[PDB]
Write a protein that binds this ligand. Structure first.
Ligand code: HEM
Length: 147
């Protein structure tokens, strides 16, 4: 769960992170860079590499889904349930077992791509709030994946 201060920062910065493409450029940057830093993850996702066009496509879906969890930050129960259902869907995805450990480096790639877009707006309070929101969102997905 997020405190009211954290929910406020997430909601405000999400408007700039979504920009004029519902965050699709952030999603492409996040996944391209994650696969370039961790080449082994391409096999998990079933991609040929960081330049496979499926990376842009999936990066956009991931970001749109984050925007849906942000719209429910006012009702944590709804956000958690929604993310658990996405997690359950992941039981049928990829070519390699999806491990909880993979989520941490993806979080780092996501926060760096958000900063690359919003610059100075990603201050101390935004980094703290987005780390806690990613922990909540990823943690709920993992609970569904492992159910
Ligand atoms: C390292 C962690 C992850 C891996 C390996 C992974 C893997 C995948 C794969 C292989 C697919 C589907 C491609 C196909 O349809 O065959 C997928 C789809 C998707 N992933 Fe992930 N995923 C991860 C993390 C996440 C996160 C953190 C989110 C959201 C916050 C997310 C949300 C989605 C969504 C929205 C889709 C599209 C399909 C659907 O809505 O069920 N994933 N993921």
């Amino acid at each position: 769960g997020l405190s009211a201060a954290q929910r406020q920062v997430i909601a405000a910065t999400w408007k700039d992170i979504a920009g004029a493409d519902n965050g699709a450029g952030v999603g492409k940057k996040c996944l391209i860079k994650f696969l370039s830093a961790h080449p082994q993850m391409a096999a998990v996702f079933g991609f040929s590499g960081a330049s496979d066009p499926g990376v842009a496509a999936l990066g956009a879906k991931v970001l749109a889904q984050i925007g849906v969890a942000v719209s429910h930050l006012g009702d944590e129960g709804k956000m958690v349930a929604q993310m658990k259902a996405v997690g359950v869907r992941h039981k049928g995805y990829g070519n390699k077992h999806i491990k909880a450990q993979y989520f941490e480096p993806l979080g780092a790639s996501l926060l760096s791509a958000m900063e690359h877009r919003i610059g100075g707006k990603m201050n101390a309070a935004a980094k703290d709030a987005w780390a806690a929101a990613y922990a909540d969102i990823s943690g709920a997905l993992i609970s569904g994946l492992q159910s």
